[PDB]
């Protein structure tokens, strides 16, 4: 029994085979249309049918976004097909860019962006595998700042007047976790007593750093390319009854992360040597803060006076001061 | 009945009558199935199944009625048991191989030697002449061989006929012709009635080219309607499940001799190390460190050789054996022209259906895409299956079968409404599971089966069904709580898997606290068992949960006990009986394995001082008497009736005096265990000095000294000298003094010789003298 | 929290008010609620006035207005049609749920129940017209049907609505036997049982027996049978008590549900002769023949083999054997035109009477039956063997 | 309590006795003629032991009075078959039962 468990954890799970691009190309191929001979209304392809099924499931009204076995599977397949991944020449760089554009078109021509928005809106601000896979798929579709996907998402949001999308986005923003000096010291005491549970290493510090990075990278890709429409829509939604300030929410999360990083700096100030797990947590927090900084820089990069004024009147200065202090003393 | 094709009213009424016949016997109502066997007989069922001029609605109804009466119960049991692989280790299991021969060609799914444990198939003969009344277990009998032969013949005829696309299908529609017949075939295949030859024949019928063993088209390439496509998807799903089961059994068979080789080799290496320990103590230490690790880590690092990883000491022979088996398993899974394989056949058929028609059924779309994803991700099947895979020796087979039968009974009862008979049946099942040895000896198997999850589903069904108004079936809640406590106690891993549900248990912690004779069988007791004697889980405890417990304690200390005031007990302004259990849970939270937990102790002390009402009427201030005065008053209350009992057997007697004394003792013990440690006081942690100062302010020294000085009541031997032992459920038990002394040592401490001598004079010494006086054998 | 709102001379510091707009659907639903409350209160007051004192004058009784409002409300609480697009159907379903919630929170279920109760004090349309005049008498049944349909639409598909109606289910079932309310009450009960499990928890043996009595005294209605099916199981959970009650109270009777059996096909064969008696006819009145059986398996199938011998009579000089079915199931003696003998019984008109004879036994191999017919005095006699 | 008349004669002397297994093969009808049970439908003979309260004693007494290889018709009153309770779901209360029993074998 022990060997079976170890074999599952070490060999079967670690097995990796790449099939997503081939599978999605096969799904996207319509096939045998003249043999079908009906052609009444330009029949949809299997990939389009799958995306429509997921979109209808998302649009169906429910109190809680129920976990979908199938949605995990196929969202991961779609994102992996999208990304499909030294010195390289301009020609091959452009070849890769065009291949990425075609792979993203294979999905966003069939409603993938609308599916992502619908699933995020239906998440209602509750973190989970649903929204994690949805954010990963959205990042895959929006990689490189896809102007067409950005336009499709903005048009869908404006036509549907979805306040729930921004409400759920904000709820996920507060639900994102930060460093935890408490329950880091508890983990330290557990290591000191010496016996560890059968469960893996404690990830209570930065519970979902990958999820946080995915959310903020999704926001960065929404605003990517100095897209003033998204840059202003995130700050305020003109056509909606209720507005949510995504910029200020990002500032609040950045302030929380800065406070947590300062907390670990003060914890490790007396100790001369940094422990390995403390270095781990510092690296993860630095990555998250870097992503948040990039997201803000994308909010304001193309000159957006409204976002700049919001940041100036926000609490960004306190976070920057704390970060400067931490940077200096870590140096 | 063939005249009903033109009488619509009677047709509709009889169809709904068949639906009612199915409904009354639905979900394992064996008594109703036996009763229905009289109204609908085996010859009538067979005639309805086989007749070709049968109306479509009546044909579907009679197929459904046959399946529900005779096959639904066992089909559901087997399909529920399907996703769990328990492979007993025998020579038959060891003989199992991935491929039939050296030529790596997939065999037909289902056929072969499978040794995984399956539910027993039993039927009872319907006979209303008998008066045994024991035939209401198991479904009524039916001729399985005759049914299987008829099903095969009819499916062959349907395949041969529908290939011509005739205008006269059985039932007047292709759906009416195929959906009932294919449903019956699928039910039989799930039941596993089909043998090797019949499986071969029916797989040829399903697809001739793919399943051929070394013009004519199978059921898959026939331009099917949507319900028939859904049924075919179910069939292919079952075939894939059979393939996964075969793979798991082959993996276990290989694992036998692989582990046999590894274990003998590790013994050889340890013997070599013991023979050659003499070069260096340090070298011996860090080369035997591998043997000092837990067996799970030993297995992991012995298997950590998939790519390079020279840290693994496994010899190249054993490494090559594992590598060869892994390559064989990958080839079987299809990781690395006629399709000739189920994986391809399913993939092309699903893609072809999806691109041939715009499917209007979301269920069909979901089933087809689930099947396609399963075909492409062959590794995921093993990833989900191996955690559910468990192996046992031959001696445990019968006990494992009995335990699986009991678990199946409980899981089946999960699908019926909660009632008195259901409570009796599932209580009996839980007791049988207790008395089974495998439950104690295989905690990992228990957790893999997820029995705690089913028991908590039962618990939620009983509780959340209006627990605010009144808890119906409290005996069932008590039994479930006892089960979950034993599950916690058996294994530490079970305790951790149990700890994940602390929030719900603490939310429903006030179910049966104030009722005696059911202590140890409450959700609070389950939470206490989950936290019991586990430093990791005690540290994992959280301030929100501790605050919930403290709020419950404050409510108990502020309000009276409703059941007690209704039953007739005097209405005092607090609830010691319920408060004591919350105090005990907090004691478990803050004290673990003979030592205090600093974080939990500090949090609990902070919450208690934020809410001072938790200490009771006394110790609250603003007119509250001292602890000694409260204890003396409680002694007087216990001695005097009409204040201790209800005055309108342990259910009727609560002994409020003992309740108050026990509550105060439990609070004192909890505070004493929350008190800091002496070395930390010497170090000078301001939090520790603050905690000690707070506890000293709460509890004066004189109160503790007086309570310790309170006298006892010893038994007397008078009126012929028979022993007259005072009742302890009402008396001053010495556990109260034990808590007093624990707090006195932990917080105040005795260091001054004068204080120690005064405490000896006024306190312990009378108790010591009385204990000496109680040396009489009858009195001892 | 129930904070009273007052006027003060200086107020407080925290006296600010924010304003939240209401959706157009919510505003329309609220105004419809007000209008329906007004009209139904007028109707209830009129019915109460007529019941208390039969003035038959100076009382509104807005029959036409009530009928039109009931039709409008039924249209308002209509589920979206199936051919509509998925998102439009979702929007319409959301609107319907909001409308039902608003109506329940304003308490219109109780208003509809009160109107139905006030209307049910009159047994018949003529009885209602006795107090209200022909227009109200004519519209009485239509208004009752519309009210029941409105109740079903209001509580259909809403778990909260059905859970609240669970307490009122008994009052609903109490009037199953009324002809004018049978269909509406059945539909409402079906909706409640399908939606709310608390409905099943409240349903007891008496209600099930009342439903079965409705089946017994109203005919073969499949909707009642569907209601019993819904009582049996709900949301994949079976109620063993309901299943047992339905079984033990419906199945053993065998007098209401259609009964099925497997019946052997029966074929009748006759010679070419035709024997008849008439005044002045040249036909002899006494006849005799024999049948000897060479082989007979008692049970070819699960049912005993049918073998009868005797005389059959035509219906008025017609070669067709009078009475009986042409196809199968019936043999000699299964009608009042044939007279048979199976070895143990004398069959005529599908009724069998045991006949005594030496070595009393059913017809078996190597058995000779002699049949004698006399028409002078009409009489058929049999002789097994000699 | 049970009243018996023949359909096909048996051997006339071989009867069920102490501690024997009667293998009969029967069909059961109510007094109105409606069938409710039959071993012929299940295609399996009914085996029951004598004097051990395994069957309704009307059936028991009819089988005891039968002979080997015989076919008989047994009429059982409600007081000897199922009483006023009946058998829930199949036999209604106070039902007179009629059985066509063939004594296939004795063992």
Sequence-distant contacts of A98-104: CB under 8 A, at least 24 apart: A100/A143, A100/A144, A101/A144, A101/A146, A103/A21, A104/A140, A104/A141, A104/A142, A104/A143, A104/A146, A104/A149
Any C CB within 8 A of B324 CB? no
CB B38 within 8 A of CB D36: yes
- Report the candidate in A205, A149, A222, A207 with the shortest Cα–Cα distance to residue A175: A207
Rounded CA gap, B652 and B564, in Å?
10
DSSP element (H, E) containing B717: strand B716-718
D34 touches chain B (CB under 8 A): no
| Whether the Cβ atoms of residue C110 and residue C79 lie closer than 8 Å to each other | no
Record: contact C248-D88, CB cut-off 8 A:
yes
Query: Interior CA angle at A230 toward A224 and A231, to 5°?
Result: 80
Residues in B 428-457 with any Cβ partner in A closer than 8 A: 444
Give the C-alpha distances (Å, rounded to integers) separating C298 from C295, C360, C363.
10, 16, 9
3-state secondary structure A159-188: HHCCHHHHHHHHHHHHHCCCCCCCCCHHHH
Quote the minimal CA–CA distance from C176 to chain D in Å: 25
Output DSSP code: residue B6. S
Contact C93 A56 (CB under 8 A): no
Cα–Cα distance measured from residue B341 to residue B420, given in angstroms and rounded to the nearest whole number: 52
Rounded Cα distance, C233 and B577, in Å: 42
Beta-carbon pairs below 8 A across chains A and B: 112
Q: Which of C253, C302, C355 to mutate to test the interface with D (most CBs of D within 10 A)?
A: C302
Rounded to a whole number of angstroms, the CA Rg of chain C reads: 36
The C-alpha atoms of residue A296 and residue A251 are separated, in whole angstroms, by: 8
- Between CA B644 and CA B628 the distance in angstroms is 19
- Whether D55 sits inside 8 A of B130 (CB atoms) is yes
What CA–CA distance (Å, rounded) separates B220 from A294? 53
Q: How far apart are the C-alpha atoms of B381 and B82, rounded to whole Å? A: 13
Structure tokens at A308: 């700049």
* Euclidean distance between CA atoms B373 and B371, whole angstroms: 5
Report the sign of the C-alpha dihedral through residues B638, B642, B646, B650, in that order. Answer: positive
Query: Are B180 and B59 within 8 A, CB to CB?
Result: yes
Within 8 A of A45 by CB-CB distance, chain B residues are 355
Partner-chain contact C93 A241, CB within 8 Å:
no
Q: Do chains D and A touch (3 or more CB pairs under 8 A)?
A: no
Token digits for B157?
């005829």
Please state, in angstroms and as integers, the Cα–Cα distance from residue B430 to each residue in B398, B403, B438, B460, B473, following that order.
18, 10, 13, 16, 15
Q: At what angle do helices C134-155 and C86-106 cross, to 10 degrees?
A: 110
Q: Distance (Å, rounded) from C-alpha B221 to C-alpha B349?
A: 8
Best of D72, D90, D98 to substitute, by most chain C Cβ atoms within 10 angstroms, is D90
Task: Measure Cα distances from B441 to B396, C34, C161 in Å.
Answer: 10, 69, 51
What distance in Å separates the CA atoms of residue A196 and residue A190, rounded to the nearest whole number? Answer: 7
Rounded CA separation C39/C59 (Å):
14
List CB contacts of B152: < 8 A, sequence separation 6 or more: B198, B201, B202, B205
The whole-angstrom separation of Cα A264 and Cα A282 is 8
State the Cα–Cα distance between residues A53 and A134, nearest whole angstrom. 15
**Where are the extended beta strands (E) located within chain D?**
2-8, 21-30, 35-38, 46-49, 71-76, 97-106
Bridge partners of C233, per DSSP, are C238
Residue B405: C-alpha distances to residues B412, B444, B483, C189, D16 (Å): 10, 18, 17, 39, 40
Nearest-neighbour CA in chain D from C229: distance (Å): 17
Chain B partners of C259 at a C-beta cutoff of 8 Å?
A: 39
> In angstroms, rounded to a whole number, what is the distance separating the alpha carbons of residues C357 and C241?
53
- Which tokens belong to B80? 């529920």
Q: What is the β-pairing status of strands B123-124 and B139-140?
A: parallel
**Paired sense of beta strands B85-88 and B389-392, if any:** parallel
With CA atoms as reference, the chain B residue closest to A73 would be B373
With an 8 Å Cβ cutoff, is B683 touching chain A? no
Contact C248, D89 (CB under 8 A): yes
Residue B596 phi, psi dihedral angles, 5° rounding: -85, 155
The residue with tokens 């191999």 is C365
CA distance to A174, B372, B405, per residue, from A66 (Å): 21, 22, 32
Sheet holding C379-384, edge to edge: C286-293, C367-374, C379-384
- The secondary structure of C132-151 as a DSSP string is H-HHHHHHHHHHHHHHHHHH
Among candidates B32, B40, B47 on the partner chain, residue whose Cβ is nearest the Cβ of C247: B32
Q: Which of residues 412-471 of B touch C (CB under 8 A)?
A: 415-417, 419, 421-422
Q: Which residues contact B31 (CB under 8 A, 6 or more apart)?
A: B136, C244, D88, D89
CB C329 within 8 A of CB B2: no
C-alpha distance across the termini of chain B, in Å: 87
Q: How far apart are CA B400 and CA D65, in angstroms?
A: 49
Q: Pull the structure tokens for residue A279.
A: 């270095």
Task: Report yes or no: B12 at the C interface, CB cutoff 8 Å.
Answer: yes
How many C-beta atoms lie closer than 10 Å to residue C279's C-beta?
4
Return the DSSP state at C305: P
Q: What is the C-alpha separation between D46 and D34, in angstroms, rounded?
A: 20
Tokens of B622: 């603003």
Residue C247: which of D34, D40, D89 has the nearest Cβ? D89
Q: What is the largest CA-CA distance in chain C?
A: 128
Among residues D15, D37, D50, D98, which one is catalytic? D37
D59 is known as an active-site residue: no
3-state secondary structure at position B681: helix
Which among B516, B525, B509 has a CA at the least distance from the CA of B564?
B516
Whether residue B323 lies within 8 A of chain C, CB to CB, comes out as no
Q: Measured between alpha carbons, how far is B246 from B116 in angstroms, rounded to an integer?
A: 9
**Contacts with C7 (C-beta within 8 Å, 6 or more apart), sequence order:** none
Give bridge partners of residue D24 from the DSSP assignment.
D46, D103
Which residues sit opposite D3 in a β-bridge? D75
Instruction: Determine whether D26 is an active site residue.
Output: yes
B663 three-state secondary structure: helix
Alpha carbon of residue D2 to chain centroid: 10
d(CA D70, CA D59): 15
Distances (CA, A) of A174 to A50, A167, A170, A203: 32, 11, 6, 19
* D48 is annotated as an active-site residue: no
Q: How far apart are CA B766 and CA B710, in angstroms?
A: 10
Contact A59 C87 (CB under 8 A): yes
Tokens, residue D86: 């009946």
What does the buried/exposed string (b/e) look like for C18-52 if buried means 16 or more CB atoms within 10 Å of the residue's CB? eeeeeeeeeeebeebbeebeebbebbbebbebbee
Compare CB distances from C302 to D34, D41, D89 and report the shortest one's residue. Answer: D41
Q: Which one of B42, B126, B131 has the shortest CB-CB distance to D55?
A: B131
Q: What string of H, E and C letters represents the secondary structure of chain A?
A: CHHHHHHHHHHHCCCCCCCHHHHHHHHHCCCCHHHHCCCCCCCCCHHHHHHHHHHHHHHCCCCCCCCCHHHHHHHHHHHHHHHCCCCCCHHHHHHHHHHHHHHHHHHHCCCHHHHHHHHHHHHCCCCCHHHHHHHHHHHHHHCCCCHHHHHHHHHHHHHHCCHHHHHHHHHHHHHCCCCCCCCCHHHHHHHHHCCCCCCCCCCCCCCCHHHHHHHHHHHHHHCCCCCHHHHHHHHCCCCCCCCCCHHHHHHHHHHHHHHHHHHHHHHHHCCCCCCHHHHHHHHHHHHHHHHHHHHHHHHHCCCCHHHHHHHHHCCHHHHHHHHHHHHHHHC
Nearest to D90 among B38, B41, B132 (CB): B38
Task: Output the six-digit token pair for B650.
Answer: 């342990």
Dihedral over Cα of A296, A301, A307, A310: its sign = positive
Neighboring chain C residues of D6 at a CB cutoff of 8 Å: 360-361
Indicate yes or no: CB of C90 within 8 angstroms of CB of A60.
yes
Q: How many CB atoms lie within 10 A of CB A132?
A: 19
Give how far B252 is from chain A: nearest CA, Å.
8
Q: Give the best residue of B296, B321, B355, B373 to mutate against chain A (max A CB count within 10 A).
A: B355
Torsion-angle region of residue B721: left (phi > 0), alpha (psi -120 to 50) or beta? left
SS3 B28: coil
Q: CA B163 to CA B178: how far, in whole Å?
A: 13
Tokens found for residue B40: 């609908």
> What residues contact residue A291 under an 8 Å CB cut-off, 6+ apart?
A212, A213, A216, A217, A220
User: Contact, D28 vs B37, CB < 8 A?
Assistant: no
> The tokens of B254 are what?
């290989």
CB-CB under 8 Å, D90 with C252: yes
Name the 3-class secondary structure at D4: strand
Q: With beta carbons less than 8 A apart as the criterion, state whether B112 and B95 touch.
A: no
Structure tokens at D101: 């029993």
Experimentally, how was this structure solved?
Answer: cryo-EM
The CA distance from B294 to B292, in Å, is: 7
Contacts of B555 (CB under 8 A, 6+ apart): none
Which residues lie closer than 8 Å to B556 by C-beta, 6 or more apart?
A: B574, B575, B576, B578, B579, B582
Q: How far apart, in whole angstroms, are the C-alpha atoms of residue B258 and residue B262?
A: 6
Q: What's the Cα-to-Cα distance from B82 to each of A70, B86, B115, C160, C244, rounded to whole Å?
A: 20, 10, 13, 37, 30
Integer Cα distance of A195 and C297 in angstroms: 83
Q: Which 8-state DSSP code applies to residue C351? A: E
Resolution in Å equals 3.3
Phi-psi region of D90 (alpha: psi -120 to 50; beta: other; left: phi over 0): alpha
Q: Do A49 and B540 touch (CB under 8 A)?
A: no
Alpha carbon of residue B358 to chain centroid: 42
Tokens (6 digits) for C196: 């709310």
Report residue B227 as tokens. 């319900």
Check if D99 is active-site.
Answer: yes
Residues B687 and B696: their CA atoms lie apart, in Å, by 14
DSSP one-letter code for B416? B
For residue B140, the surrounding DSSP H or E stretch is: strand B139-140
Cα–Cα distance measured from residue C61 to residue C45, given in angstroms and rounded to the nearest whole number: 8
Residue of B nearest to A56 (CA): B362
Helix (H, G, I), strand (E, B) or coil at C367: strand
Q: How far apart are CA B340 and CA B349, in angstroms?
A: 13
Beta carbons of A258 and A178 less than 8 angstroms apart: no
Distance from CA of C254 to the nearest CA of B (A): 9
Phi, psi of C291 (to 5 degrees): -130, 125
Separation of alpha carbons B57 and B18, rounded Å: 10
C191: number of Cβ within 10 Å: 23
Q: Active site residue: D4, D46, D56, D91, which one?
A: D56
User: In angstroms, rounded to a whole number, what is the distance separating the alpha carbons of residues D39 and D63?
Assistant: 15
* CA distance linking residue B20 with residue B24, whole number of Å: 6
* Residue closest to B583 by CA, chosen among B615, B613, B544, B559: B615
10 Å CB burial of residue A200 (0-12, 13-18, 19+) is exposed
Q: Which residues contact A185 (CB under 8 A, 6 or more apart)?
A: none
- B744 and B762 Cβ atoms separated by less than 8 Å: no
**Residue B725 CB coordination number (10 Å):** 12
Question: Ramachandran region of residue C385, left (φ > 0), alpha (ψ -120 to 50) or beta?
Answer: left
Residues of chain B in contact with residue D43, where contact means CB-CB under 8 angstroms, are 42, 143
């Amino acid at each position: 029994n022990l060997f079976l468990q170890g074999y599952e954890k070490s060999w079967i799970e670690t097995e990796e085979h790449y099939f997503e691009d081939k599978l999605i190309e096969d799904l996207a191929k319509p096939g045998a249309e003249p043999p079908e001979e009906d052609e009444g209304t330009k029949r949809v392809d299997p990939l389009h049918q799958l995306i429509l099924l997921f979109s209808r499931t998302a649009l169906t009204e429910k109190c809680k976004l129920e976990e979908d076995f199938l949605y995990m599977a196929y969202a991961d397949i779609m994102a992996k097909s999208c990304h499909d991944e030294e010195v390289k020449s301009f020609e091959e760089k452009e070849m890769e860019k065009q291949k990425l554009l075609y792979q993203q078109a294979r999905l966003h021509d069939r409603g993938a962006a609308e599916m992502v928005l619908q699933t995020i809106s239906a998440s209602k601000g509750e973190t989970g595998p649903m929204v994690a896979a949805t954010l990963k798929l959205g990042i895959a579709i929006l990689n490189g700042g896809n102007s067409t996907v950005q336009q499709k998402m903005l048009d869908y949001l404006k036509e549907k007047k979805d306040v729930g999308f921004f409400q759920s986005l904000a709820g996920l923003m507060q639900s994102c976790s930060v460093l935890d000096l408490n329950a880091f010291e508890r983990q330290n005491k557990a290591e000191g007593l010496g016996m560890v549970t059968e469960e893996g290493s404690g990830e209570k510090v930065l519970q979902d750093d990958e999820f946080t990075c995915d959310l903020f990278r999704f926001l960065q890709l929404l605003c990517e390319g100095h897209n003033s429409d998204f840059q202003n829509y995130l700050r305020t939604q003109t056509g909606n009854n209720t507005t949510v300030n995504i910029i200020i929410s990002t500032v609040d999360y950045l302030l929380r992360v800065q406070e947590s990083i300062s907390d670990f700096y003060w914890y490790y100030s007396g100790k001369d040597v940094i422990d390995e797990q403390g270095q781990r947590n510092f690296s993860k927090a630095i990555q998250v803060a870097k992503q948040v900084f990039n997201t803000l820089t994308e909010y304001i990069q193309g000159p957006c006076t409204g976002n700049q004024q919001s940041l100036a009147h926000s609490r960004l200065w306190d976070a920057v001061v704390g970060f400067l202090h931490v940077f200096a003393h870590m140096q | 009945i063939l005249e009903l094709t033109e009488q619509e009213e009677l047709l509709k009424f009889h169809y709904h009558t068949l639906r009612l016949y199915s409904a009354v016997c639905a979900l394992g109502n064996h008594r109703v199935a036996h009763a229905l066997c009289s109204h609908v007989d085996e010859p009538q069922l067979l005639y309805a199944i086989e007749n070709k001029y049968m109306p479509g609605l009546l044909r579907a109804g009679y197929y459904d009625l046959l399946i529900d009466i005779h096959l639904s119960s066992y089909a559901t049991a087997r399909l529920m048991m399907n996703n769990e692989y328990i492979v007993p280790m025998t020579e038959e299991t060891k003989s199992i191989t991935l491929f039939p021969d050296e030529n790596k060609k997939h065999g037909l799914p289902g056929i072969g030697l499978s040794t995984s444990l399956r539910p027993r198939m039993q039927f009872s003969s319907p006979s209303f002449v008998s008066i045994s009344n024991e035939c209401y277990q198991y479904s009524p009998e039916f001729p399985l061989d005759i049914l299987k032969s008829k099903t095969i013949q009819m499916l062959t005829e349907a395949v041969k006929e529908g290939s011509l696309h005739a205008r006269d299908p059985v039932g007047g529609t292709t759906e009416f012709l195929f959906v009932p017949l294919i449903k019956l075939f699928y039910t039989l295949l799930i039941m596993g009635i089909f043998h090797n030859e019949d499986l071969k024949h029916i797989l040829q019928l399903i697809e001739p080219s793919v399943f051929k063993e070394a013009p004519k088209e199978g059921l898959l390439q026939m331009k099917l309607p949507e319900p028939v496509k859904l049924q075919m998807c179910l069939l292919l799903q079952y075939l894939c499940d059979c393939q996964v089961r075969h793979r798991i059994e082959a993996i276990v068979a290989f694992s036998d001799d692989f582990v046999a080789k590894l274990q003998d080799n590790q013994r050889f290496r340890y013997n070599e190390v013991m023979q050659a320990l003499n070069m260096s103590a340090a070298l011996t230490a860090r080369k035997t460190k591998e043997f000092r690790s837990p067996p799970q880590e030993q297995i992991n690092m012995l298997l950590n050789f998939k790519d390079d990883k020279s840290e693994c000491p496994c010899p190249e022979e054993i490494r090559d054996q594992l590598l060869d088996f892994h390559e064989d398993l990958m080839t079987h899974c299809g990781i690395e022209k006629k399709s000739s394989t189920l994986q391809q056949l399913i993939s092309e058929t699903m893609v072809r259906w999806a691109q041939e028609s715009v499917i209007e059924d979301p269920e069909l779309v979901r089933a087809m895409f689930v099947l396609l994803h399963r075909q492409y991700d062959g590794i995921g099947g093993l990833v989900r299956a191996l955690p559910k895979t468990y192996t046992i020796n031959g001696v445990s087979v019968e006990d494992t079968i009995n335990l699986l039968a009991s678990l199946g009974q409980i899981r089946s009862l999960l699908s019926v409404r909660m009632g008195k008979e259901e409570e009796k049946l599932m209580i009996r099942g839980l007791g049988d599971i207790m008395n089974n040895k495998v439950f104690y000896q295989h905690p990992n198997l228990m957790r893999a089966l997820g029995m705690h999850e089913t028991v908590m589903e039962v618990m939620v069904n009983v509780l959340g069904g209006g627990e605010s108004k009144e808890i119906t079936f409290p005996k069932m809640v008590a039994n479930c709580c006892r089960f979950l406590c034993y599950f916690c106690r058996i294994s530490r891993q079970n305790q951790k898997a149990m700890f994940d549900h602390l929030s719900y248990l603490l939310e429903n912690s006030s179910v049966g606290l104030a009722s005696p004779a059911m202590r140890g069988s409450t959700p609070l007791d389950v939470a206490a068992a989950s936290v019991m004697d586990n430093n990791e889980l005690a540290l994992a405890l959280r301030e929100p949960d501790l605050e919930k417990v403290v709020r419950y304690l404050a409510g108990c200390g502020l309000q009276s006990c409703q059941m007690l005031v209704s039953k007739g007990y005097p209405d005092i302004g607090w609830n010691p009986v319920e408060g004591e259990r919350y105090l005990d849970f907090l004691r478990f939270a803050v004290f673990c394995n003979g030592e205090s937990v600093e974080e939990n102790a500090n949090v609990v002390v902070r919450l208690l001082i934020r809410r001072p009402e938790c200490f009771g009427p006394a110790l609250r201030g603003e007119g509250g008497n001292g602890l000694l005065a409260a204890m003396e008053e409680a002694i007087k209350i216990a001695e005097d009736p009409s204040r201790d009992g209800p005055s309108p057997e342990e259910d009727d007697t609560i002994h409020m005096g003992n309740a108050i004394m026990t509550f105060y003792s439990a609070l004192i013990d909890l505070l004493g265990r929350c008190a800091p440690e002496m070395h930390l006081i010497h170090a000078g942690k301001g939090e520790a000095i603050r905690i000690r100062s707070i506890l000293r302010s709460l509890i004066p020294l004189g109160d503790l000294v007086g309570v310790i000085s309170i006298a006892f009541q010893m038994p007397t031997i008078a009126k012929d000298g028979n022993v007259v032992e005072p009742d302890m459920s009402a008396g001053f038990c010495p556990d109260h003094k034990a808590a007093m002394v624990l707090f006195l040592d932990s917080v105040y401490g005795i260091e001054v010789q004068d204080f120690l001598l005064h405490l000896l004079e006024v306190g312990f010494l009378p108790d010591l003298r009385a204990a000496a006086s109680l040396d009489t054998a009858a009195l001892s | 929290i129930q904070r009273k709102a007052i006027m003060h001379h200086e107020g407080h510091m925290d006296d600010g008010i924010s304003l939240s707009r209401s959706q157009h659907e919510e505003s329309r639903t609220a105004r419809v609620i007000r209008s329906t409350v007004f009209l139904f209160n007028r109707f209830i007051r009129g019915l109460d006035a007529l019941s208390k004192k039969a003035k038959a004058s100076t009382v509104d009784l807005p029959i036409e207005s009530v009928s039109l409002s009931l039709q409008d409300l039924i249209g308002y609480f209509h589920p979206p049609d199936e051919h509509l697009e998925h998102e439009d159907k979702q929007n319409r379903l959301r609107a319907l749920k909001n409308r039902q919630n608003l109506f329940q929170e304003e308490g219109m279920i109780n208003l509809v129940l009160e109107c139905i109760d006030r209307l049910h004090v009159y047994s018949s349309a003529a009885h209602f017209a006795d107090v209200a005049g022909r227009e109200a008498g004519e519209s009485w049944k239509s208004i009752l049907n519309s009210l029941y349909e409105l109740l079903a639409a209001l509580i259909r598909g809403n778990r909260k609505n059905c859970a609240q109606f669970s307490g009122s289910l008994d009052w609903l079932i109490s009037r199953l036997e009324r002809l004018e309310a049978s269909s509406g009450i059945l539909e409402v009960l079906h909706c409640v049982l399908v939606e709310s499990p608390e409905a099943l928890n409240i349903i007891k043996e008496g209600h099930i027996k009342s439903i079965i009595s409705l089946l017994d005294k109203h005919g073969r209605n499949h909707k009642v049978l569907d209601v019993l099916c819904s009582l049996c199981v709900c949301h994949g959970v079976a109620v063993r008590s309901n299943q047992h009650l339905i079984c033990d109270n419906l199945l053993p009777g065998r007098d209401l549900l259609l009964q099925t059996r497997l019946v052997n096909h029966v074929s009748s064969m006759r010679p070419n002769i035709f024997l008849g008696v008439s005044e002045g006819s040249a036909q002899y009145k006494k006849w005799y023949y024999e049948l000897m059986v060479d082989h007979t398996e008692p049970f070819v199938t699960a049912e005993a083999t049918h073998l009868r011998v005797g005389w059959a009579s035509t219906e008025g000089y017609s070669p067709y054997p009078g009475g009986g079915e042409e196809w199968g199931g019936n043999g000699v003696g299964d009608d009042l035109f044939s007279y048979g003998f199976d070895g143990l019984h004398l069959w005529s008109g599908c009724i069998a009477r045991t006949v005594s004879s030496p070595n009393q036994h059913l017809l078996r191999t190597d058995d000779v039956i002699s049949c004698c017919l006399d028409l002078s005095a009409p009489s058929i006699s049999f002789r097994i063997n000699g | 309590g049970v009243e018996i008349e023949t359909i096909s004669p048996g051997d006339g002397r071989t009867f069920p006795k102490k501690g024997q297994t009667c293998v009969v093969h029967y069909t059961g009808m109510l007094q109105n003629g409606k069938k409710f049970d039959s071993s012929r439908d299940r295609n399996k003979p009914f085996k029951f032991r004598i004097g051990k309260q395994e069957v309704i004693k009307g059936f028991e007494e009819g089988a005891a009075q039968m002979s080997l290889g015989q076919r008989a018709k047994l009429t059982c009153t409600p007081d000897v078959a199922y009483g006023a309770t009946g058998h829930p779901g199949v036999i209604p209360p106070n039902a007179t039962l009629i059985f066509d029993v063939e004594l296939l074998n004795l063992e």
